[PDB]
Amino acid sequence: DNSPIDTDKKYYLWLREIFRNYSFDITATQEINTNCGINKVVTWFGKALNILNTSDSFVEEFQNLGAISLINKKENLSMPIIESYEIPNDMLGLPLNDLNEKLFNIYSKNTAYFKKIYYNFLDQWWTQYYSQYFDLICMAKRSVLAQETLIKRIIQKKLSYLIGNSNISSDNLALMNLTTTNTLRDISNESQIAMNNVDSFLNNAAICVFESNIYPKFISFMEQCINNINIKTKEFIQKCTNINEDEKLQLINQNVFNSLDFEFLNIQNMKSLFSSETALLIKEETWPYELVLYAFKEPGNNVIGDASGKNTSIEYSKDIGLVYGINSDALYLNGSNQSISFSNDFFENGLTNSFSIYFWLRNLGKDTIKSKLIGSKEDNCGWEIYFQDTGLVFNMIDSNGNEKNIYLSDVSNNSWHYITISVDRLKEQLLIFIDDNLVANESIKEILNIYSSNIISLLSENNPSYIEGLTILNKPTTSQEVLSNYFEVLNNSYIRDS
């Protein structure tokens, strides 16, 4: 019922809420207790595919009925045809030592045979059962794409319309267009999280079906099998002519099978099936690192680079020096002519993306005067960290002029400090940590579009300093992660001075 969208500000407020809500809907999961453990369930799965959808809740109905309730063909198993068990009639009169070591051979053949049977059951599981969960995975993934498409079309129509007829300034439209593009990427990244969710959920389910449904049929088949074998082997040993009664009892005992001889279930192996080279490559290509700064000294050369595996380009003064920091070589910026710059399309930010910045910094603190250290700014938007007074200032400003300007006290003591900054658009929360403490926790609901350049510039004007382990992430950081980063890096076996 609202008045139509006219300002660019109104478009942003709209687009952001469109994005947050989409994220909340699509990434929804609930952890449940199952036969085989705790599984992280995709909440919308039933409403998407019409599966266990006749309830008012798919989640509780799935907790009730179990993993096998999601697929249409429940009993596909075929007990395999075996090779029946006969002990040769030529061993009936053998002497102990030879009888003994010949049954040892039969023992191994048997336990190997058990393993074969299990394999056969695993193959049937894959072919008959997993095939159906993979169908569910694909359809669920298609559902996510279908939904994503609906969203993007909704966004595209609104943008297309404002551009079509509205008084919004030409170059404001321009920014809107660039910014929306970044938001559409943010929406794919969110879609991707959801498609990973359905993969874990459904893979776990399929594995639970093997433990709960297939495996026990195997165990049934195997105790019938070793019960038989046990019989034939006892009957055989009694019929042995050339050994005595004390020998028979020790022999029957040596050769008897029990359930443990065939309990092959290894749940970690079940899980490791789905870790392929591809699954790994995808992890490394899609992880949160947008920048990971490394540095080291080659003979006659200082090396600086980015390990994120992203598109980051690095440009830096030729004479920048390196010095051992906390865990590695640190960059020395003299404050006068030296600068370094990192280029990634992600760095421009936008309306809807989240990110974290962290690094170690030691500043030989002199002046109180406000000076650029590091930031990304264009057309007076984006973020900057300044040296000021004895501390830092974190500045954040949007295209409408709304600002965060936050003083972090006492950071230039000429001691190393671990700076962590976290920007979370889903929770609308800014978090700033110094070392192991949380120095600022703020709402950023009032900050809208921070689109900046694709370049982050490390200047360190007027304040010679050391910078180490600079990192940019496309996700927010929690307090547990900060503590873990901080302390893990800190014990490398080195003792430190004040």
320 is an interface residue for another protein by CB under 8 A: no
Smallest separation, CB 96 to another protein (Å): 14
**Footprint of another protein on residues 186-225 (CB under 8 A)?**
211
Q: Which is nearer to another protein, 153 or 161 (CB)?
A: 153
- Give the Cα separation of 132 and 68 in Å (integer): 10
After which residues, if any, is the chain broken (C to N > 2.5 Å)?
none
Under the binding rule (CB under 8 A), the answer on residue 440 touching another protein is yes
Query: What residues form DSSP beta bridges with 323?
Result: 330
Query: What is the Cα–Cα distance from 213 to 221, expressed in whole angstroms?
Result: 13
Q: Which of residues 380-399 bind another protein (CB under 8 A)?
A: 388-389, 393
CB nearer to another protein: give 433 or 451.
Answer: 433
236 touches 87 (CB < 8 A): yes
Among 408, 450, 458, 467, binds another protein (CB under 8 A): 408
User: Which residue, 318 or 496, has its beta carbon nearer to another protein?
Assistant: 496
Q: Which is nearer to another protein, 15 or 229 (CB)?
A: 229
- Residue 498 found at the interface with another protein (CB under 8 A): no
Q: Of residues 298, 337, 401, 498, which one binds another protein by CB under 8 A? A: 298
The answer to whether the CB of 166 falls within 8 A of the CB of 176 is: no
Rule CB under 8 A: say whether 95 interacts with another protein. Answer: no
**Smallest gap from residue 328 Cβ to another protein (A):** 10
Q: How many CB atoms lie within 10 A of CB 129?
A: 24
Residue 195: other Cβ atoms inside 10 A:
19
Residues of span 98-137 touching another protein by CB under 8 A? 101, 104-105, 107-109, 112-113, 116-117, 120, 124, 131, 134-135
Q: Which stretch binds another protein (CB under 8 A): 217-225, 358-366, 436-444, 450-458?
A: 436-444
Asked if residue 472 binds another protein (CB under 8 A), the reply is no
CB 463 within 8 A of CB 371: yes
Considering the complex, state which of residue 168 and residue 184 has its C-beta at the smaller distance from another protein: 184
**Residue 278 lies near another protein (rule: CB under 8 A):** yes
Residues 343-382 that bind another protein (CB under 8 A): 368-370
Q: Mark the segment that binds another protein (CB under 8 A) among 9-17, 354-362, 437-445, 455-463.
A: 437-445
d(CA 483, CA 478): 9
Three-state secondary structure call for residue 263 = coil
Q: Is residue 406 a contact residue for another protein (CB under 8 A)?
A: yes
Q: Which of 65, 138, 249, 314 binds another protein (CB under 8 A)?
A: 138
In order, the DSSP letters of 440-459 are EEEE-TT-------SEEEE-
Distance CA(237)–CA(243), nearest Å, equals: 9
How far apart are alpha carbons 445 and 435 in whole angstroms?
A: 26
Residue 260 binds to another protein (criterion: CB under 8 A): yes
Cα 80 from Cα 488, distance rounded (Å): 53
3-state SS, residue 221: helix
Q: Which of 2, 54, 75, 83 binds another protein (CB under 8 A)?
A: 83
Q: Which is nearer to another protein, 12 or 257 (CB)?
A: 257
Q: How far is the CB of 4 from another protein (least distance, A)?
A: 27
Q: Between β-strands 38-42 and 455-458, what pairing exists: parallel, antiparallel or unpaired?
A: unpaired
Nearest residue (CB) to another protein, 55 versus 443:
443
Toward another protein, which CB reaches closer, 242 or 259? 259
Q: 5 or 22: whose CB is closer to another protein?
A: 22
Does residue 493 belong to the site contacting another protein (CB under 8 A)? yes
Distance (Å, whole) CA 320 – CA 332: 6
Instruction: Let me know the angle formed at the C-alpha of 102 by 101 and 104, rounded to the nearest 5 degrees.
Output: 65
For position 305 contacting another protein by CB under 8 A, the verdict is yes
DSSP 315-382: EE-TT-EEEE-SSSEEEEE-SSS--EEEE-GGGG--SS--EEEEEEEEE-----S-EEEEEEEETTEE
- CB-wise, 64 or 169, nearer to another protein? 64
According to DSSP, residue 403 is labeled E
DSSP string across 142-157: HHHHHHHHHHHHHHHH
Least CB distance from residue 45 to another protein, whole Å?
17
Measured in residues, the chain has a length of: 498
Site size toward another protein, by CB under 8 A: 96
Q: Is 37 left (phi over 0), alpha (psi -120 to 50) or beta?
A: left
Q: Which of 483, 485, 489, 490: binder of another protein (CB under 8 A)?
A: 483
The minimum distance between CB 1 and another protein, in angstroms, equals 20
